[PDB]
């Protein structure tokens, strides 16, 4: 089969950037909305025993790209495609994945059961809420990491990253941060609400590390306690950065460093509105990764390098 | 088990009078979004070993309500409740039915699929566009008819009624159009784009029926042909009214005596920008579809009177 | 893999047909009756990897046909072939396609379940009694249309086709009479019972146009109404002539100018007692979409030409 | 719930015992053939939360009462009952139950798998060819026994039961008749083909228990074995009798003392053109079996008395 | 339907408490090995209309007694219960959740999928691994919590719990301790390898909490930390107490004040060998869910009390 | 794809066997067990899309080894392999394929079922204890016979076997020796329980042939009753040699000439205990039916040579 890549009407612009790692142009599909608000998508090639990618990122409207998803999957499926393979940089409703409360949904539970029943084959995914949303499907899942090239950021823009500490803004981060600190020879510390730091913080470059920001109601206060604390500057890195709400707001008005993010939520309308916010690409990760599911070859690989 | 009726957040009022019909009090469920839109449903009562109705019809922003009306199927159902039943009064995607087009999707397939998954046992609807979506389940699915009441209004409000002329816009609608004429013993017509009509019309109150009036651009050159055809006032009796888009704009620019639908989508905010357009109340027989269904009674009981 | 095309026992002439458009032979499949009346199946050549097709119409005796058809997939989806394609000319049991009786059932969609745990994995058919039966599977389903034909016969053997006019003999058939007019730049009529006639007809040649005829109770009713509405003659073509009963009795009885009908059904024997009878081949057309699955090529371009 | 007895086109003396013993009377249901020979079914009452069960037999034509039933269940299971339950006396395609063949197929899964895609959630049957068709289905399946039947005809009919012999006219019987022969304290034979037997049989009456006699082309060969091999007289005992193709000619051209079968296929005509022939009745466990089903009792009590 | 409660092979002592306090006798089941070492289930009661309960814990012959309860539970299922639900107060393979190595499995899900397919329709179980595990079920999967028993043993024993410290042995345990430190008002620690101690724990009474202890490798080495750190005495409380391999040996060779388990695995081997070792009576939480579940009363209600 | 050979735990000389016909090596898999006894499979090479073939027989510890046999299929599968084979010698609970007790599980479809959930697409067995297994299977299930090299045997090494006879130790094991003595023109006996001798016997050398031997309680006493009854030398010949409890040291105290069984099933430690044990090589048609199925040839050719 061949690669067919297609772009849905959230961040394109990251769809492109894919296209061209890979060497290849997007496909012919146009999606757009009826008059009452209904789904349009029009695909304008034929799939047909195709290596179907579908690139649609959890952001923006959520339920919009939701459902514009699940009818470009179908499509492929019925039009007699080979295999359809989601990519989804940032995956909806990730963090309602248990039921800790008396009548509450998993909602990510019901996403994984739609994309199955839609008809895709495989699906690929960049640092998830919680790694075991894996095992919510029966299809082979892809869980990449964009700590790598967290790694490789602080390096090279963090001058005394030798002789910093490493900051959990929650109770549940300390998974994240530990393997972190440990690449690179740091300590670490945690900060817990109901806020509490443990950790020496004090006189020293503290970076608060978090997968994702959504209004920044932590991180915020994360950042005002450990200035408190004796740290001299704080440094945020995040992987989905949404800032939805105040969250700009908040971060124009903190004392950050800096404010780094990835390309799986677009950035380019927020980066007008906080000098703070900064990118690290990942569509070579992602590319990658396409590149060698379609050839069969080892995406472990990708877990060993930038 | 006893009945609890749930309401989504398209259509409060329906939900209510039906509530009133039945005799009891809607179930306590919270209904929001989160800052980055995100559907979030709080259940507030156990809804364990109990019959679920949960009323919500496919307009306004569709892909947001049909979000909404999955996680409170799949809560419910996660919660032990003995049966979960969708009241639909408007099915979403009820127009992309079939493929005839290269690579066109199914949408009223993928939809009903997502109500499946979720776990909903029965679905009760009314007037859907193509009555073979109910073999698009696997599980009962009621149809209802708003012709009783169709006809009710017409033998009250229209004084020339045994001496007028049912008047189809499109080629798909005669099946309506000539139920309805048989059973009031007048002639009918029908009207064909690509506009020719066939039918007396001449010097007679002609009504056009169809099931859906979306942007009303068929209710409309229908309308002038029928004018120019020597038929004295004419009439427009809808089932759906969406009326999205410039529908207004051309319902109050149009030579309609009246335009009149039923409470399947929200008409009271329609009605302030519109004097043309009149509702007919079809909460008592959704009512007495989800009392019969609930009790084990013959809903076929409702295909005889009104 | 390669094309294995096998036969059923109904409508062998049209098999052999396909075969020789595609070049060659029917497989090996000897199928018989035991002395219980239990169908005997025994597939005399591997079909392991391969893209086996099987053409069976819904003709005849109707259930021993489909228990053959079901025994046949079964049979080659646990010899390991790669995939099963069910060709099936005319569908069974596609007039009970919905549920509006009190306790009716829906027949299209079981017949569709079965073939579906059967273990076919693509449907190619012809001009379904109603399109939305493509739903009723969650496999690709090819719907082939025998309109490019039907207008080719009208060109060149109705001389008068550039004034003519298509009657549609009943309400449910305007959708594919005003197509046919539409590409014809001619006017069209209908005919409902309940019989009464909308349209000019008066001092012109008349066309009857519908999907099948079982009995011919209908356009025999039709054509009277006709002739006494002033049309000078009368023509009948149809898609899927089953002329069951009656039928025959009554054709030879009317005062149609010809009956047309379509491969999709064995025509040889009633052709022996109805001189009115023609038949149109769509063997072609059936050839080339065989051809264009197993290729990978688009089946779109049959809907441009012949 | 209520039982809802049904019964098929195929043997309605044994449902109108059934339903004798069960003090009750018939569900209405008329099922008849269309004109191109489909099946119709039009259930008369309502089945909402009942607990049907349909008797129909695997006898007559096969396909047709096939069908039939597939039909009956899924218009049960989408009319809202609360369970359906297949009484089949005899199972049909249950002689296919492997594959021993180069691609032949297993017809006693696909049937398997057709009921259960109907919607049915429990099977009685009799007499089972295989007993392991019990594993073929995910849902309860009951298995009852002809055998304290068999054995109480024995000891009331035949006078010199006590020093008897008991033959098994195939290799895979041997089961029936060692099973038999323990419960009556009496000695057995085998015949095998390719005729040999091992046995006494001399100077004793002989009697042949099989399962099933479709064709009586054994059971006739083997009665001539025993009666050159020194047996007085020989009886034989079948449960299911189909008596199918010649059979009845070669049962009034043979020296049986009697040929004796059950209730679970019609056998009015055959008994009128042969004398030996006579019947068991089975209407009295069917319907004990139907009681105990319903009302949640030990099914399990039936296998140790009549 | 009537409670009938089964149990397994594994923890028949927990089994006999629960039934206790639900006042009920235990169903009759036996449960051998056959010589080649498979499962033999023989129930000796009959299930039919029952809401059957089996409690097994993965512990011991973790394959055997998991292999013990899907033969359980698909017996049942086949025997005509009502509902079968599985209670697992240990759930096995709970360590293998997600997929971060080349070919790693998902066994956390097989086994989900294994409990579904013997046709299991509700799981009760206490303190998951990875409370995602809920969202590896399409059915209620019911997560209770053994922390209200851990703070009731704290409060009662320890004296100096108003003054006492939280430790966590590992990085991914910092959830419940920060949990528990915030439900006791006082501070808490954690405890990385690869060891480092963040907090004070000098001249205090520090507590190690974690969810199992397999080999004890860990909080062995965390009691080694904590004491040359400064704390006074060491406390370890966990869930599950499995004490497989040396764990005993490096138990009885620590200075741990005391270590407490639960009744979730069989402790009364293991309290001979080591005087260190407490349990926890949880037979009253899991009796209460399993009466609130069968009642239909809020089995919320537990998440407020002891 | 590229055929990657694995093997489990049990029989691993079978499958060096295997692969040394096949002429390649066998797959890097490590499969150890964790401290608290569960199973871990630990894959060392790229199985992305490759044929999988995993060799594991139901020896020894049946419940370790089955549940390894599923983590490895599943691994695989999620691994995103082409296809996934289960080689299985010795089916698993192949004795419990009905239901003929009072609640009895079906464990042979229990696990056909995990089978089937855990990934797999083809089945590869030989002898089955019921052939009809084949049908609790919806894929591919291939059914290899040991008869070939059993007649082999026999010709080559018993001197008297064109004037021999075959004894059949139960009822149910008479279509076994009917088909081996018409291949042989040799005549033939049967033994049935509650001890019973059909056959000549006398003055002869008897050959008792079964499918499998668990614990011998079968012949030995049927060797015993075949020495009293006037045979020379008795011979067994079986296929699946178990030989747990008991057994040796029944086969060491009898009177066999020689106890001949397969590979299936390791015999390398037996023989050591027992001189009368010998073995019969299948490494060869197992490698012959994994390389015809690989390469898509006819494994019908297997069934008509040795
Ligand atoms: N889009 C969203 N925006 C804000 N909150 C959300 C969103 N989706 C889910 N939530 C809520 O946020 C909570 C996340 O809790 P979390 O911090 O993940 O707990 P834990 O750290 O124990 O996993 C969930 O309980 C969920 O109810
Ligand atoms: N550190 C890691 N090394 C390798 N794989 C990882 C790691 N962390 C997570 N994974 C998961 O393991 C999977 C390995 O992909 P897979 O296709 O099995 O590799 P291969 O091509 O070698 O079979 C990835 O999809 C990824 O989600
Ligand atoms: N004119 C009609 N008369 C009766 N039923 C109809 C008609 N039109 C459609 N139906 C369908 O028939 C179904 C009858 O409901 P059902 O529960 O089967 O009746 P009962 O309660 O008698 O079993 C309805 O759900 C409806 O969708
Ligand atoms: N007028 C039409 N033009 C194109 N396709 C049509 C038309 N009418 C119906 N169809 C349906 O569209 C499908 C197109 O086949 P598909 O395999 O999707 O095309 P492609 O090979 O381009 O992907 C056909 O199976 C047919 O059923
Ligand atoms: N000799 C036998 N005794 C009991 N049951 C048998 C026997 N032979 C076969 N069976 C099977 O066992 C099943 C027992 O039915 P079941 O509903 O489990 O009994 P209970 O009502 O006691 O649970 C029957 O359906 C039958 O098919
Ligand atoms: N703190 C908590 N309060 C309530 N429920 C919780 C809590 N933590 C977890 N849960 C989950 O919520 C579920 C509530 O059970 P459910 O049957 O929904 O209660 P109800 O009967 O009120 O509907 C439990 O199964 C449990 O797994
Ligand atoms: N005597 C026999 N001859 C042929 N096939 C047999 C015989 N006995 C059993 N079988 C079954 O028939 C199947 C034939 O395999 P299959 O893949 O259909 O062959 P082919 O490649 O010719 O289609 C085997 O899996 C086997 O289980
Ligand atoms: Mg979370
Ligand atoms: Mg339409
Ligand atoms: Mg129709
Ligand atoms: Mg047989
Ligand atoms: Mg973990
Ligand atoms: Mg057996």
Redesign the interface.
């Given at each position: 089969p061949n690669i067919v890549l297609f772009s849905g009407s959230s961040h394109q612009d990251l769809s492109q950037r894919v296209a061209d790692r890979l060497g290849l142009e997007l496909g012919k599909v146009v999606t757009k909305k009826?008059?009452?608000?209904?789904?349009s998508?029009?695909?304008?090639e034929?799939?047909?025993?195709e290596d179907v990618y579908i690139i649609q990122s959890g952001?923006?409207?959520?339920?919009?790209n939701?459902?514009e998803l699940?009818?470009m999957i179908?499509?492929?499926k019925?039009?007699?495609s080979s295999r359809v393979t989601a990519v989804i940089p940032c995956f909806?409703?990730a963090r309602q994945?248990?039921?800790?409360?008396?009548?509450?949904?998993?909602?990510?539970?019901?996403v994984?059961?739609?994309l199955?029943?839609?008809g895709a084959d495989?699906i690929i995914t960049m640092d998830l809420h919680?790694?075991?949303?894996?095992?919510?499907f029966?299809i082979?899942?892809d869980?990449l990491y964009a700590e790598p090239a967290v790694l490789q950021w602080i390096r090279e823009n963090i001058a005394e990253w030798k002789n910093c500490i490493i900051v959990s803004p929650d109770?549940?981060g300390?998974?994240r941060?530990?393997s972190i600190a440990?690449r690179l020879n740091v300590?670490?510390?945690?900060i817990?609400k109901?806020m509490?730091l443990?950790?020496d913080v004090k006189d020293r470059v503290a970076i608060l590390v978090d997968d994702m920001a959504?209004?920044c109601g932590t991180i915020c206060h994360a950042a005002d306690k450990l200035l408190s604390a004796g740290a001299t500057k704080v440094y945020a890195i995040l992987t989905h950065g949404?800032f939805?709400?105040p969250?700009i707001s908040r971060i124009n008005n903190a004392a950050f460093e800096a404010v780094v993010v990835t390309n799986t939520i677009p950035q380019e309308d927020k980066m007008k509105h906080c000098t703070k916010i900064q990118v690290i690409d990942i569509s070579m990760i992602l590319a990658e990764a396409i590149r060698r599911?379609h050839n069969?070859?080892?995406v472990?690989y990708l877990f060993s390098h930038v």
């Open positions: 009826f008059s009452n608000q209904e789904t998508v029009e695909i304008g034929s799939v047909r025993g952001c923006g409207e959520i339920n919009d939701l459902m699940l009818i179908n499509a492929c019925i039009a007699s909806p409703y994945d248990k039921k800790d409360k008396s009548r509450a949904p998993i909602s990510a539970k019901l994984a059961n739609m199955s029943v839609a495989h919680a790694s075991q949303i894996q095992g919510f029966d082979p899942v869980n109770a549940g300390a998974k941060v530990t440990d300590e670490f510390a945690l817990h109901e509490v443990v950790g959504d209004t949404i939805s709400g969250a599911t069969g070859e080892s472990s």
